[PDB]
From a paper:
One of the major routes to such materials is rigid body sequence-independent docking of cyclic oligomers into architectures with point group or lattice symmetries.
We set out to experimentally evaluate symmetric one- and two-component structures with polyhedral group symmetry generated using RPXDock. Given a set of prevalidated homomeric scaffolds with cyclic symmetry, we generated docks using RPXDock, and the resulting interfaces were sequence-optimized via Rosetta sequence design. E. Characterization of the two-component octahedral assembly O43-rpxdock-EK1 by cryogenic electron microscopy.
Author numbering:
A (entry chain Y), B (entry chain g), C (entry chain 3), D (entry chain c), E (entry chain C), F (entry chain 7): 1 to 139
G (entry chain d), H (entry chain P), I (entry chain Z): 1 to 100
The structure:
Amino acid sequence: DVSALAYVMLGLLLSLLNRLSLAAEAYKKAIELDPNDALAWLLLGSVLEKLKRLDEAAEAYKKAIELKPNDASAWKELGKVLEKLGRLDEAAEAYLIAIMLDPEDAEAAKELGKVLEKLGELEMAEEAYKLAIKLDPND
Amino acid sequence: DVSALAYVMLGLLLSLLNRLSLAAEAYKKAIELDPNDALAWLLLGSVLEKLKRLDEAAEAYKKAIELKPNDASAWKELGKVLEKLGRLDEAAEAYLIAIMLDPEDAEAAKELGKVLEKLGELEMAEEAYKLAIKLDPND
Amino acid sequence: DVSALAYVMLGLLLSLLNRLSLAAEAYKKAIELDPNDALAWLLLGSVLEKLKRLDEAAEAYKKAIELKPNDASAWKELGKVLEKLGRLDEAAEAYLIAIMLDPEDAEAAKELGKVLEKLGELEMAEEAYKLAIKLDPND
Amino acid sequence: DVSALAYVMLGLLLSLLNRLSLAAEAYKKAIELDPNDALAWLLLGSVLEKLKRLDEAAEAYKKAIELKPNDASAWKELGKVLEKLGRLDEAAEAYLIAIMLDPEDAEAAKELGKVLEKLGELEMAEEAYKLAIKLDPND
Amino acid sequence: DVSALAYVMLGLLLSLLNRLSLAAEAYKKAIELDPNDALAWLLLGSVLEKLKRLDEAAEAYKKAIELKPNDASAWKELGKVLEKLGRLDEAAEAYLIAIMLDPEDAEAAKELGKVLEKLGELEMAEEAYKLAIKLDPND
Amino acid sequence: DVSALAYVMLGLLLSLLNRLSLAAEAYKKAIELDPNDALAWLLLGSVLEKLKRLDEAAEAYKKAIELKPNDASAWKELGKVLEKLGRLDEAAEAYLIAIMLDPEDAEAAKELGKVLEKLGELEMAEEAYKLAIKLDPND
Amino acid sequence: EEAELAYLLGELAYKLGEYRIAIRAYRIALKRDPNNAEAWYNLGNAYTKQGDYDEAIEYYLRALVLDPNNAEAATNLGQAYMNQGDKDRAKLMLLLALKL
Amino acid sequence: EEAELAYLLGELAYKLGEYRIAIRAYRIALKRDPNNAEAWYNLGNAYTKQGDYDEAIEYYLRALVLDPNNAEAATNLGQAYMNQGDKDRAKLMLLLALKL
Amino acid sequence: EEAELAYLLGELAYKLGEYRIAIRAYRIALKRDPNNAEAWYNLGNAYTKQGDYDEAIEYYLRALVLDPNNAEAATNLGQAYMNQGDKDRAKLMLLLALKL
């Protein structure tokens, strides 16, 4: 039944109006109608982080990443949320996964350099930063 | 049937694009399809408030709150409407309920100070302003 | 169908016509159609009373009272029958129930005083007679 | 349905293993499936007898005797229980009934003599003992 | 269907014929037909006990006891198995439960005295032994 | 259903009560209702063995072992019957298989030693006897 | 039935002097078990200690109807009538108590 | 309904100073009737006498939200905040009590 | 479950010496929930304070059977046995209490 999808549109619309707090609860009903929707989980994860509600946002992102693998951008966003949460090692792991999925992603390399520098792997952080610069000199 | 939500979506679009006066009617049709919807009423309140038809926005917010208690956002919006209607006692009550729902909400404290000062409870208004500052100086 | 009630009217007519001995049988048929009728038993009690078959009039009144508690006049009539049966203790009890159900009717106090005089409770009989005289002037 | 007898068989087996205390319960379930079974009652009586619940066994024996009269063995087995309980008059009655049902049972005469001697009918006890001796000189 | 009990009968016969090792399997099939039967578990416990397979007999007795909580004799057999397993504390607990279910069981008191003596509770063991002797000197 | 099993009980009874020759027929009736019963054949084996009709007892044991492998008891019994029949090689094979199914059994070692002594494998018979003496203290 | 639980709460409240709540408890009990003579008598007693003699009379009467041998209820009703100044009714019920 | 009988038990326990029972009784009552203002207020009062001032706050807040005119609840909430050392919230709620 | 409310009434009654009320309330509770060890123990305590040591024994036994580690129940059971003059059982259960 199309109702399973309509709630996703409702959440997106509410997100466009900056009424995010209602958008999350709109996505929740869609999930409770169909827990297998990768798009619902991903959008909910990206909404929750804007409410400064981080840990649930990381949870939603991670649940999305199980439902469909290999999406190099979901890993990057989970890396951002983990980095904000201070779980720097797991954030480095996430950005490394992003690198593995797409070796040409310069943003992933920049974030990996940032997280490795924060984490104290100075040599590897510098290497990642240099790779990011070399991959996208226009960045 | 999904139409009950389709109308909400139509009104959301007509409020996103600047045609509020049609959005109100769309929300009204949605309500008549399903009076128990806690989101239709809540959005209709804001739409009517933006049209400056405050006398109806206050009632819309109140019905929404009746349909879904403990909503720390609906109480604040109803407080704004009540202040603009000049019924500062009810506005103070609304903001008090808001701060008592979310004791960490700095904005609720600031608004309570505002309405208390205009209502002549100078000491309580000062205390609320201090509470707002302590909870978040940026709010 | 109305047959369960018709026999009550037949007995009432026969009693009204001064044909009691057939009225008793009519009431008995009515009872056998429906033993729960609080109105059959009471009229049968009065009919048997006036035929001077007191021994069963007392039982008919008691059955009626059991089937329809908390009414004064049935207790009054049962008290009268008990009084004429010589069971003055039970008669005093019945008139006492009548007073307890309605403390304002002089007739019950008067007859209780009569029984108590015959029962030898001179002081209580005097109290009952005074109460009867105070409750109504003509009795 | 054969279960009503299967339970009797289970009780017999358990008695044969010397687990009497479970056999009693098996017999009881058998009885509750078919209260008119005389064999269940009789075997339950003789099981409760050896659990030394004498007075509980006497009732089972009596019910069995009620369910099939003239059972010359059941009467003697009830007489033994009654004799152990010391209700010697009823025991004498039971052994006398045993004599009446089968005048040639030497054991009945012997135990009737024993019970009469305990009961103080010395002459009758001696007569019963002599009868038992004459019936079965090989006893 | 009666088969569920016919298997119990088969196990009892095999145990009675001194072929226990097949009786255990017969009881197991009976249990798999109906796990709630108290007799099946209780008898399987003793069959396994006689085969010296104590490790399983203890659990069989426990499974039985969970289905007849206040059985005054299942506890005693479980106590014997536990004592032979060397879990003297749990054996003392079992015999204490046995005494508390039937304060007049002299055998339970004597066995509790034995277990306490082996366990080093010399004073309590002597108390239990004296109590058992007072309840019955031959037990 | 259950009739297929009842005959096994009938044979067990007629063997428990000493009427083997009817028990064999009862077992045969059971088999002709279900050839696959591993318990009917095994018992028929020992029943025929006790009647000293060994030529059939060995066959019944072998069919049972075919229907239900790995049970050392059946192998040992078949070895006993083969020992009686004088097929010492097959008896030694049976006892060897019994040891290999359960290397901790002293009885199998003792039987193998006896059979190998009779068969002329003096050294192996002595080894088996020593193993039997080492496996259990009373055999 | 839980009517007995409510009655027990009422009795405990009364014995400990919490008449104000004893009334409510006895009411919860009675409205589910109207034939309970003891409950009616105790409710009347609770109102008596409270000083609400009209209600006490009204409930004492209902108690006596259900239990005409209740000498204690008769004495209490007589005292209540005396508190209401109906010395005639009070004397009647006190004499009834002496008779019972 | 039990929502009243259990509340009565809670009130009786609290009046007699047996707070350990009062808390549990009020909870059993509230499980059926969450809109009961006085029940929340008394539960917070029991926790206050017990000295669990923050939990007393947590329940006084719901007492006030369901009954915004409850001046006594505001007073006790302010006192609980003061016990928690939040002089600012305490003073605000005390002033609220005086205003109401 | 109303068993909880009845038990709470029993506990409140017992803490205030209303042993009749305690017994009746605990009994109302237990017939709804027979596996409640502490209810049996408290009922035994009530009968003990009444001096009805036979009933106290009969209920302390069930308390121990459902909770074999209950040292307090063992102590009170031994005390009840001593009150019954059974020095042997009393000593046995007191030693059990010390062991537990």
